[PDB]
Design an enzyme around this catalytic site. Structure first.
Site, PDB file in Angstrom:
ATOM      1  CG  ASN A  11     -41.131 -10.074 -15.731  1.00  0.00           C
ATOM      2  OD1 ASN A  11     -41.347 -10.698 -15.714  1.00  0.00           O
ATOM      3  ND2 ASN A  11     -39.940  -9.384 -15.526  1.00  0.00           N
ATOM      4  NE  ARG A  95     -37.208 -12.295 -16.909  1.00  0.00           N
ATOM      5  CZ  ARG A  95     -36.117 -11.063 -16.690  1.00  0.00           C
ATOM      6  NH1 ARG A  95     -36.986 -10.342 -15.820  1.00  0.00           N
ATOM      7  NH2 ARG A  95     -35.077 -11.678 -15.796  1.00  0.00           N
ATOM      8  CG  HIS A 184     -29.961 -12.774 -14.157  1.00  0.00           C
ATOM      9  ND1 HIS A 184     -29.682 -13.238 -12.571  1.00  0.00           N
ATOM     10  CD2 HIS A 184     -31.124 -11.654 -13.569  1.00  0.00           C
ATOM     11  CE1 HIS A 184     -29.552 -12.912 -11.725  1.00  0.00           C
ATOM     12  NE2 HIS A 184     -30.676 -11.779 -12.510  1.00  0.00           N
ATOM     13  NE  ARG A 245     -34.120 -15.455  -5.427  1.00  0.00           N
ATOM     14  CZ  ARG A 245     -33.735 -15.099  -6.919  1.00  0.00           C
ATOM     15  NH1 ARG A 245     -33.211 -14.310  -7.351  1.00  0.00           N
ATOM     16  NH2 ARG A 245     -35.424 -14.976  -7.430  1.00  0.00           N
ATOM     17  CD  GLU A 392     -33.119  -7.819 -17.893  1.00  0.00           C
ATOM     18  OE1 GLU A 392     -33.724  -6.747 -16.788  1.00  0.00           O
ATOM     19  OE2 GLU A 392     -32.923  -8.972 -16.765  1.00  0.00           O
TER      20      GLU A 392
END
Ligand code: AMP
Ligand code: AMP
Lengths: 453, 453
Positions: A11, A95, A184, A245, A392
């Site tokens: 990632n 990813r 996600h 965020r 993940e």
């Protein structure tokens, strides 16, 4: 045992490369780590090999290629490494944040696939460039294995148009592919499948709502085993309160502020993505642990921020219960806040008792581990409440393995290892043994999986 | 009877002045109308006096002052007018869109109040300028009566900080008053009080959710008789699907589009406010009647738009049921779509049966009139469903009357005429008589008000 079926997952961010090494045939994480400050002075790898002390080395990485080279050298090192040579790795899973509506499932990267990713880069401008740089870098270092893209938006491509369309000029959808995408995806895929196992149901018969509450946070409405709606948007900005965020906001508020401040779009975009959320409300805290600690010290900004996060979660649960058209089988909490934030979970669920969500406070307080899937609802709660730590990296690993083998497909036509009632996570099973030595009562809330033995 | 207790109400836009004349002591609307194309070539008044044919006159109005003068001349005209002279008017109630957090209730306008309105003008840049121009114009024409501001945001000033704060830098709240405000305040106030009467409850004991579905559309969560949350935002752009406004959207989507198009903030603001919503999705329709007719002809864009409106309403009802922390006493539909859009109401409510909202389709199909308050839920629905035609002009009228008299206060400390079980709307009672001649079955769904006789 045979040690040659190893999968590397990566990632890559603008300044970092996170990695994991998974031995598929021995069902084990051999190592994980991160190279930090990639492209910057002071690049450094932190490498965690199974059963060994943390290893840290400063080594310059002016490019992502240097970072991948440093990872491979560290993994094959005779003293600190975990594989005998680079050819032990048989596939790499990368990813990729945004696939637009061009990718509904993971893919083996080819030059043509890379050209297609460039067509969607403008949808994920803050994330895709570095993801692609990581693919290109790893292809130079490991040229003889398939490099696979596992795409954060793909899970959500089952959404119907009534969920994914914004009420905007249709030309913006048709010409620029402007619509809700969601993120996600690997976390929702994994946790949705685990929830089905725990419920003893085929995935296509499940109706659940999953809250991935990490530093980034989003919710997914899973209707008949497929994403039906989700809280992030065209980009990861929309929806729940997050560490930095804003989540949901009047689309005109950034204009009012831009007029007030002189800020321009890219720097309003960064304020909403990097200076908002919990950090904006509190003025100083990103991590929910700090928010909760400060609230307990009397900090009114932290108390407000905690309550805003809770309230927005309550509203999204209510919205997605409505969207399902029926009582959900279960709600699921995952990611760091979902797994450890017992106070957030309590406050959310206590406001939802009239919607069938009845938490057991004693069970909830015990569920503060990454090493177990637990049920924290009262025994007779209409809606079950599960804490399912996500994985993940396993989705990325298995997608790469299955693409390499040639059996991979979209999840409505493909079966994952972790859909078995007997699936086990070896590292978490060992961590759970340690957790139970210190808190034996935790054993009372670990899920009982139908058909497991 | 005595005809000298007359109240004028005005709603001024950049190009229009809408008016109503209310005789308080005779409890009657004497006239209503609009001057169109104010400040433009071809200004024209359409004047509807009680019991008379529509009167239309073209007369130039280069300013709002000319428009107010034309209204007064028309109202006092011996043949088409409704009052003997301008001094019959004893107070004027003006619509002001935005009060920021500086106004929690209606006010008599003074020079200092006008200065305070200028401090909040930047919050309502598309609406407040013309509202204020209308006040200044009417003060010149009718200098000897109180001019009162009835403020669309004021109803929502009971919202708690957990509802009104966005997850943005706290400095933007502190320095620029950036927060959720909400609109349709006069409609929510009126319909909330009527709902309490219909339920036979004191307002402070009511927990209801109201959908004002007009060309603009918003929802209000009324907790213990006060606004707790609402779907519009800093501005009227946020929330539900509207005729030309987008409602909810990823705050970053306008940036993606601006980069793609070259558009700048004010023209992105106009695209989101004037080219989005149903018009954007369908490419051509604003009015829900046109959307529904086109859907029935097979238009897939209209079918999508209808369904998007329904779905977002379902989500907001679910979110606000969660926010209430208990089953609502009732949901309320109001404004043009709420009162006539039986297909929207059916589709919304059928998706909420698991949340206690059970519509009766036969009752729902009968509720297609502005002239009656009706109950359209099944007899045993846990949550009542009311259609309550709104009366924003009456709130403006009564606020002006009570401010003139000196008894006005915020609604938690003030009693409106229409809180009486025996309150009647004379014009609607006459229209209902006509409706019942054509559809006698409508009488079966008109609300039965506790204590009325
Ligand atoms: N013990 C804890 N309690 C509450 N929140 C936590 C805890 N540990 C981690 N977190 C949150 O989890 C986030 C990381 O989640 P993730 O994105 O799943 O790695 C951090 O930014 C924290 O806000
Ligand atoms: N018969 C009807 N059926 C559905 N919608 C209607 C009908 N009549 C009016 N409307 C809607 O009501 C809107 C005006 O509502 P209002 O803002 O309350 O005046 C129009 O723009 C239409 O979309």
């Amino acid at each position: 045992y045979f040690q040659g079926m190893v999968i590397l997952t990566l990632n890559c961010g603008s300044s970092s490369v996170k990695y994991q090494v998974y031995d598929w045939d021995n069902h084990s994480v051999l190592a994980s780590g991160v190279v930090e400050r990639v492209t910057q002075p002071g690049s450094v790898i932190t490498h965690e090999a199974k059963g060994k002390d943390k290893y840290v080395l400063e080594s310059p990485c002016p490019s992502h290629t240097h970072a991948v080279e440093l990872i491979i050298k560290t993994l094959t090192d005779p003293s600190v490494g975990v594989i005998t040579d680079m050819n032990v790795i048989k596939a790499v899973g990368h990813r990729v944040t945004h696939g637009g509506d061009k990718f509904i499932k993971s893919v083996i990267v080819t030059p043509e696939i890379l050209n297609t990713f460039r067509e969607v880069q403008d949808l994920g401008p803050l994330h895709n460039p570095a993801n692609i740089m990581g693919i290109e870098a790893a292809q130079k270092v490991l040229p003889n294995v398939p490099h696979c893209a596992i795409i954060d938006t793909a899970w959500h491509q089952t959404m119907p148009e009534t969920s994914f369309m914004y009420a905007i000029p249709h030309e913006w959808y048709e010409k620029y592919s402007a619509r809700r995408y969601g993120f996600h995806g690997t976390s929702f895929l994994y946790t949705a499948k685990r929830a089905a196992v725990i419920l003893g149901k085929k995935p296509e018969d499940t109706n659940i709502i999953i809250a991935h509450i990490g530093n980034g946070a989003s919710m997914c409405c899973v209707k008949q085993g497929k994403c039906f709606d989700t809280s992030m948007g065209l980009t990861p900005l929309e929806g729940l309160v997050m560490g930095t965020r804003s989540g949901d906001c009047d689309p005109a508020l950034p204009f009012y502020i831009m007029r007030k401040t002189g800020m321009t779009p890219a720097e309003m975009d960064t304020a909403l993505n990097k200076k908002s959320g919990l950090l904006g409300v509190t003025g100083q805290y990103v991590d929910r642990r700090d928010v909760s600690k400060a609230m307990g010290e009397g900090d009114k900004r932290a108390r407000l921020a905690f309550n805003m996060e809770v309230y927005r979660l309550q509203k999204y649960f209510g919205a997605y219960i409505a969207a399902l058209g029926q009582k959900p089988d279960a709600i699921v909490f995952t990611a760091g806040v979902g797994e450890f934030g017992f106070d957030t979970r309590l406050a959310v669920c206590e406001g939802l008792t009239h919607l069938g969500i009845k938490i057991d406070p004693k069970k909830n307080a015990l569920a503060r581990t990454r090493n177990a899937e637990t049920c924290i609802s009262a025994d007779d709660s209409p809606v079950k409440i599960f804490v399912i730590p996500t994985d993940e990296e396993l989705v990325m690993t298995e997608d790469a393995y299955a693409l390499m083998k040639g059996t991979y497909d979209v999840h409505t036509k493909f079966t994952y290892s972790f859909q078995s009632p007997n699936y086990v996570n070896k590292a978490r099973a060992e961590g759970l043994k340690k957790d139970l030595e210190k808190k034996p009562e935790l054993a009372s809330i670990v899920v009982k999986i139908p058909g497991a033995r």
